[PDB]
């Protein structure tokens, strides 16, 4: 019968999940990221395209899908034309407003991405509100890009002598393949303008800080907290006593302990959630067209 | 007669001054910034030819030029040739190098230069030792472009409410023309990438802070203690007291004040100096091809 498609087009990558209109899961897709401000639009869409296709083993009829790098009125203005060429159907909206309608449904609340950016989105019965969620130059606190630029600055303190060489040290030289400071400065004059390679240096922070390097945890705990402190700010405002954790840093269990622990001590309570960015998309779409969400239940 | 010029290629821009060899001043030349990672080879080396033109009224007969971007040896093979076409004999070094020797000539010493990027440089009677200075991305803790940084994060997050809206936060929209979140948002995305355009901001900081505000002065202290820190670090490693300070950064009364605060906690004591990189680069030529560096003595 009727395909329905709902993505998540974030930084690090693009997930799809497809579904009829009775509830039925039919398939999931992945590709790159979804970000045109790190991929180029005819990327960004292509990637979409592809997510969409391998979920919906085809064409689809209604696709929803949360965005990441929607930050201002000229992003919209750009992505949405070619976007609506995909399906028939088509629902746009910020990544941050998805994963937060995802968890609460319609009602007052607050979620926290965390990914290759970070944003966090809240709702007051009104409208949604979000703080952050501009991009890694000027936001992205606590966000892979974050981590893993702390990484890099931290390394090169360590080669001039300044700090103690950790296991952090090893780890970040062998994930960008660098054996020494002329090679990190190669590395970094090629490297310093694409997101993903930065970012890619947070698993190297994640690895370091499971061993025990405090140096690790240390940036983790810096990042979390920055970010976590902008989700008690929003969690206070709108009035919620919860905020919804989402996104690839919350993989890591150091970066998610301190997190939580600093809600907690703010008297926030988190939470990981039971409903994906993507599945929210499936949701929103199902309002749109008519579908029943109830038929979503499983057990 | 002969015609000898000293140059400093920085990040800021390039100055040049020419004299004869008989220590008589010919003239002075700028032109845009020095540094080929911020404006390409082609353009950086049109910028010191431009430079050494002005002040020499013509062709000179030796350069002497400290550069600011040679931080790997790949950096040095592809500079040095075109380098070597601006004159009959050219005379080369890191900017750092050039910036310490003006000052110690030959002798043991650290130097601190905080500009659009920044450096620590010692000797320690053997050897050049560097601390920092190795770009924007990995470095340049305290430079104008880490300031300007900072300044529009901050700036975000007063947009965001989750800081109250200071003096800086005028200054900042003022500066880049921007007049919301919008429009800060597009800037970025555009200018994300131009170091020039980010490290313009450090001008703004140094405005709010000299009108008492404190969040201004909060960027200000934490970028010069952290660019202090090396110092302190590199001093006490070399067995110096002092270390001498360059830079357009010490330019900001504010700055210089917590950087020489900090250096004094440590038993360290700052100067500015007498001598510039570029006429250290003048007493380097000198010294090359025989001319009396006394000769340069005035009053
Ligand atoms: O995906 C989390 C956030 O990442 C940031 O880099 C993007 O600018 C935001 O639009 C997004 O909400
Ligand atoms: O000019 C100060 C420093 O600026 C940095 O951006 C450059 O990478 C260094 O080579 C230079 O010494």
């Given at each position: 019968?009727?395909?329905?498609v709902?993505?998540?087009?974030?930084?690090?990558?693009?997930?799809?999940?497809?579904?009829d209109?009775?509830?039925?899961?039919?398939?999931?897709?992945?590709?790159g990221?979804?970000?045109?401000?790190?991929?180029?639009?005819?990327?960004?869409?292509?990637?979409?395209?592809?997510?969409?296709?391998?979920?919906?083993?085809?064409?689809?009829?209604?696709?929803?899908?949360?965005?990441?790098?929607?930050?201002?009125?000229?992003?919209?203005?750009?992505?949405?034309?070619?976007?609506?060429?995909?399906?028939?159907?088509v629902?746009?909206?910020?990544?941050?407003?998805?994963?937060?309608?995802?968890?609460?449904?319609?009602?007052?609340?607050?979620?926290?991405?965390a990914?290759?950016?970070?944003?966090?989105?809240?709702?007051?019965?009104?409208?949604?509100?979000?703080?952050?969620?501009?991009?890694?130059?000027?936001?992205?606190?606590?966000?892979?890009?974050?981590?893993?630029?702390?990484?890099?600055?931290?390394?090169?303190?360590?080669?001039?002598?300044?700090?103690?060489?950790?296991?952090?040290?090893?780890?970040?030289?062998?994930?960008?393949?660098?054996?020494?400071l002329?090679?990190?400065?190669?590395?970094?004059?090629?490297?310093?303008?694409?997101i993903?390679?930065?970012?890619?240096?947070?698993?190297?922070?994640?690895?370091?800080a499971?061993?025990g390097?405090?140096?690790?945890?240390?940036?983790?705990?810096?990042?979390?907290?920055?970010?976590?402190?902008?989700?008690?700010?929003?969690?206070?405002?709108?009035?919620?006593?919860?905020?919804?954790?989402?996104?690839?840093?919350?993989?890591?269990?150091?970066?998610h302990?301190?997190?939580?622990?600093?809600?907690?001590?703010?008297?926030?309570?988190?939470?990981?959630?039971?409903?994906?960015?993507?599945?929210?998309?499936?949701?929103?779409?199902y309002?749109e067209?008519?579908?029943?969400?109830?038929?979503?239940?499983?057990?």
């Amino acid at each position: 019968m009727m395909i329905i498609v709902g993505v998540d087009a974030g930084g690090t990558k693009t997930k799809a999940v497809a579904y009829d209109c009775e509830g039925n899961f039919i398939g999931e897709g992945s590709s790159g990221p979804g970000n045109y401000h790190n991929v180029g639009l005819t990327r960004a869409i292509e990637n979409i395209k592809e997510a969409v296709k391998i979920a919906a083993k085809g064409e689809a009829d209604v696709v929803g899908m949360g965005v990441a790098g929607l930050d201002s009125k000229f992003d919209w203005e750009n992505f949405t034309p070619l976007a609506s060429l995909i399906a028939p159907k088509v629902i746009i909206q910020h990544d941050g407003v998805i994963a937060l309608f995802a968890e609460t449904l319609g009602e007052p609340g607050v979620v926290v991405i965390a990914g290759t950016g970070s944003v966090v989105e809240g709702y007051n019965g009104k409208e949604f509100l979000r703080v952050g969620g501009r991009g890694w130059l000027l936001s992205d606190d606590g966000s892979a890009y974050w981590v893993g630029r702390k990484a890099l600055r931290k390394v090169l303190k360590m080669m001039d002598g300044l700090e103690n060489k950790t296991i952090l040290y090893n780890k970040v030289l062998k994930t960008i393949n660098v054996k020494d400071l002329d090679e990190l400065v190669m590395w970094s004059y090629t490297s310093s303008c694409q997101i993903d390679l930065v970012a890619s240096i947070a698993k190297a922070v994640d690895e370091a800080a499971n061993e025990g390097d405090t140096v690790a945890m240390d940036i983790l705990k810096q990042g979390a907290e920055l970010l976590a402190s902008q989700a008690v700010y929003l969690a206070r405002k709108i009035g919620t006593n919860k905020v919804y954790l989402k996104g690839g840093m919350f993989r890591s269990n150091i970066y998610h302990k301190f997190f939580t622990l600093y809600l907690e001590k703010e008297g926030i309570i988190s939470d990981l959630g039971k409903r994906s960015p993507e599945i929210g998309a499936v949701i929103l779409a199902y309002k749109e067209v008519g579908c029943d969400i109830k038929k979503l239940i499983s057990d």
